[PDB]
C-alpha cells in the first residue's frame, strides 16, 4: 500500500531508463534481454508466419 507522497517520490528515487536517479548517484534502471516478453505476438506476427 503506497501513500501518494511515497509513490510520487518513487520516480525521483529510482529514476528511469532515460535519465539518472537523484537519490542514487549515477544509477540507471536495468534493461531486460527481451524488449517485449509477449512471445505469442512475436511468434504469430505477419513477418514470421510469412
Amino acid at each position: 500500500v503506497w501513500t501518494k507522497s511515497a509513490y510520487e517520490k518513487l520516480d525521483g528515487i529510482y529514476g528511469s531508463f532515460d535519465k539518472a536517479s537523484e537519490k542514487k548517484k549515477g544509477y540507471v534502471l536495468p534493461r531486460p534481454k527481451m524488449a517485449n516478453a509477449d512471445l505469442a505476438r512475436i511468434i504469430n506476427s505477419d513477418e514470421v508466419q510469412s
Binding site: 501518494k4 509513490y7 510520487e8 518513487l10 520516480d11 528515487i13 529510482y14 529514476g15 528511469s16 531508463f17 534502471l29 536495468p30 534493461r31 531486460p32
Partner: protein
Amino acid sequence: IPTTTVQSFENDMATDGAVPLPAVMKAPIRPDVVTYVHSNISKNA
C-alpha cells in the same frame, strides 16, 4: 504515460489522484537475481 488512481478515504475531501506510473514499476522482474540477493543478504543479521 499510464496513470495510477489514488484511493480516497471518507475523511478526505478531494478525490484528485492521477499519479503518473513510475518507471520502476516496469523494471525487469528477475526471480533468480531476487532469490540470490535475498538468500545472500539474509545471512547478514
